[PDB]
Design an enzyme around this catalytic site. Structure first.
Site, mmCIF file in Angstrom:
data_model
loop_
_atom_site.group_PDB
_atom_site.id
_atom_site.type_symbol
_atom_site.label_atom_id
_atom_site.label_comp_id
_atom_site.label_asym_id
_atom_site.label_seq_id
_atom_site.Cartn_x
_atom_site.Cartn_y
_atom_site.Cartn_z
ATOM 1 N N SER A 227 -14.583 87.688 8.188
ATOM 2 C CA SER A 227 -15.190 88.922 8.355
ATOM 3 C C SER A 227 -15.793 89.136 9.723
ATOM 4 C CB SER A 227 -16.147 89.063 7.177
ATOM 5 O OG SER A 227 -15.470 89.205 5.902
ATOM 6 N N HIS B 264 -10.395 90.574 6.825
ATOM 7 C CA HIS B 264 -10.940 91.838 5.866
ATOM 8 C C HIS B 264 -12.449 91.751 6.191
ATOM 9 C CE1 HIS B 264 -11.855 94.411 2.759
ATOM 10 N NE2 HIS B 264 -12.758 93.639 2.099
#
Lengths: 186, 186, 183, 181, 178, 178, 180
Positions: D85, D110
């Site tokens: 992230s 993600h």
């Protein structure tokens, strides 16, 4: 604020200035006494002490008074604002010729008697300390002002204030000033 | 945040700049008074003081006022934002020729006097200090502006604000500036 | 974390970089104003100011604004992230030619006791709004009336809109794209 | 621990090394951004950044990403452990040729995430996803749509898969294996 | 205030002055013992110790006592305010010729405050303290023990007569280096 | 205690000594990783690491392990007291020839959205640790995995036979630099 | 108060003096062990350790004991007041010829002490046997004589400790220390 205070402390020591501002408590007395002894070891040059205090712990005032009298350097005493109780005791430690005041300073010589605490077994011990302390304070201010101890004892009440001009006539203050240039070193 | 403030303090002292920002309290007064005395011991060169304050304890402003008057270096006074009550008292300590303002600065000479606290025995003493303080403040601002004490007293109510141009006509501000290059040292 | 911040403070001063990050409050204003005046006493060389702020106290923004204008060094202004309210007031203090933005930066201009004392307080807020309308008018070239009409709600601008509005002079991604005044 | 961290900060600055460890938060971003700018003002020599982070606040990852791109010195990126992230956003800020990984590193691209201003929140969510897809597309050589199709909550890349994907240039075990630009 | 206390302690050490102020606790013993040994390593010149203490832990006073006796520099003892209990033990460590007091100082001696073994340890400590104060004052251990059964207070002049204080002073100029 | 620890850390860095004492947590890992990288930037000379730890977070130990393996200086590993869990992972990062222990040291090899995926990550982590200790000791991964299922304690001599410790020593003079 | 301790540690390091004053706890052991290693890196010159401790943590004394034995500089051990439990173990780490005592010093050599109790038992035995051998080697007594004395709390005065083999010399001045 500890870091800022420590830095101002260091600089104040380097210029031989000590500040007694606000309530005189054990924390201040502990710091002031060390400052005075440090300065005295560094040189015999005068030390400037600025007092603006409404009072405080008398044992803390006594500690500062005793340190002023103990060290060799003369303490130049500049009173401003209110110089009351423990602050006035401190103020009186300096030699008369070195006691200055700003025009608006008000002085209170009365010392609060304080509270008793401890066993009843030793009440006689408490009695004599009360008498002894009052007699010591009367002599200190009598010697500092030129008044008699009886006059000091009679004059000193909880609401007996002296303005700067009254403090000069009373013998507590030598000279009223507004500028550091008006100080005369011994 | 103590470490940042102490480091910024050290650098500001080295460039002889003092900041009076926000409410004037005992903590601000202790630091500013010491800074001024430290700077005066180092040299007689001017000191720059930047004032942006909505007010505070009149006794704390009074301490800074007395220190500005006591030391030998001239304080160059730059007012910005709001210069009110205790902050205006501080501002008025500088010599007239050294009092500068930004264009948007607003000045309030009125001093709030509330907050009395203490024993009822000292009721008469509190009365006289209120009267004495109002009279001292009127005379301070009269001398700083060239107005009479009676004119200061008549004008300086709670809602009597002066903008920078009105402050110049009144005698409080010498010159309105936007740049530090516009300062002329004495 | 004070010790770390104090050391980063010291190094940033030596390289003439000032960071305005997060909410603008009295504490930031005290520090930034001191930093600016310290840097100006050291030299007239430019000062780089990095602004990424979601808002804050307008009077605190005002202090930084006034200090930027008052000192002699030119402040090179780099906007990143959000430049909102008090942060946009700070941003607007720099000369137009020195106002830079990253492409993704967003800008936000928005208006900042008894019944008698609220009336006087009202007149103070009006005074503040009108001064702010004029500050941003001078900074952007818009009229105060246009600033006032746009700012009665939340007027958000992306970087390209902020260029068209007059607030941002140049969108950049690299420090190499800065041109100092007078080259 | 302030005094310890400050002394190590001083030494780390002197050797041009920056550490991004643990959750990426506002305090880390403030410190890292200043370090990068200080180092850039001192010289144009490379800066070594060591990243091992499970994620954090995207505004903080964005601030570090923006600073890496803004300064002139090239940042040499060494990823270890988990780079997920916000940490992967930071990692992607460096040039491809300067992105290294340890053998055990796992990468996750993600990024997770007043009723009146609901329309504004919507548009920012869309705006942010679109910026992230294009950032990772440029960093890897994939298209934004391929990034968008592949990146979901459980789409992890090991170091060898991250090399094949274009995210990592070279897997290394020793600092001697780094090649400066 | 730790930063202030640390800075003043450092400046005081550089001028060979040690302050024993307030309650004698373990932390003070740790600091004072180190200060004394640091000063002793630097030189054999005298050390000035300023004592104003209302009491404290006797075992901590004992650690400072032993360090004063062990190091080579002479410790010049200036008592002011209160010199009580553990503080009086510290004070008594200096040679008699080096024990000064201000006029207003007051001094307090007082006995320290499975079960039989603890008794035998308390008696041992009481007997050790009696002999320490006997040797320091010139009084007999029996007189020390009898006087200290309860709180035995002395003003400065009484403390001189008792042998605890050698000389009453108000000025550092009245100190003579040995 | 920040000031004292900061002072001792600074002096230890100047002599290329790193202390890993107590629980292994993220804060310690951050500090130790920086110290190792700082020392590696200064020179390629050996680094002495002293480990006495009752355990801690495995990922924090993993960061230190990775840094030890990554930098160019050889880390000389001296275990004492307890070398447990995260501390044992750190210990195992050193080359076998550089793993020393005191006689009394005890070693403990402790094992660490959807519930399914959290499982697979724990299994992934457990299997990685099995292989790390297998390579460090010369035991098989299956032996490591079976032994660490429970709390597997080793005395120093058992740790030598197990392959974790190369040499038991009492004096720094018994260290041979590689 | 961290700053005061930090400044005094700095000065103590420069004069090669280490203090074990008061209770032996983990925080003390961490600082002393590092100080010893720092001093050992600075030079091989002797290190003075002043021990005046009524006891403390069992494991913390061992850390100091092990570090004293590990470093190359000889540690000059001066015991004062009470040297008990962890303090006595630390005291015993120094070579016999370097173990000094003040005249009034008292020494106590005895050390105080869910599913698998057997592991807990054997370490208690292991520790007692470890301690008996340390003090046997430090004094020249047999482990059985040591073990018999360590059943309860067996105290020694300075003169008794000299005859027992724990203390080499009773002194009152640092001038009476003779370096090896």
């Amino acid at each position: 604020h500890g870091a800022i205070g420590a830095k101002l402390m260091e600089y104040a020591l380097k210029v031989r200035k000590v500040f007694v501002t606000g309530g005189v408590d054990e924390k201040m007395a502990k710091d002031v006494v060390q400052q005075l002894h440090i300065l005295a070891s560094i040189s015999d040059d005068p030390i400037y002490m600025f007092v603006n205090s409404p009072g405080g712990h008398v044992e803390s005032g006594d500690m500062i008074f005793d340190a002023i009298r103990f060290i060799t350097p003369k303490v130049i005493m500049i009173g401003s604002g209110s110089v009351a109780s423990a602050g006035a005791l401190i103020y009186a430690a300096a030699d008369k010729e070195n006691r200055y005041s700003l025009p608006n300073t008000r002085f209170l010589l009365h010392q609060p008697s304080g509270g008793i605490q401890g066993p009843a077994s030793n009440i006689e011990i408490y009695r004599r300390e009360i008498v002894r302390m009052k007699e010591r304070l009367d002599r200190i201010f009598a010697e500092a002002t030129g008044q008699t101890p009886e006059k000091i004892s009679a004059d000193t009440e909880r609401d007996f204030w002296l303005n700067a001009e009254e403090a000069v006539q009373y013998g507590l203050v030598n000279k009223i000033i507004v500028s550091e240039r008006e100080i005369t070193l011994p």
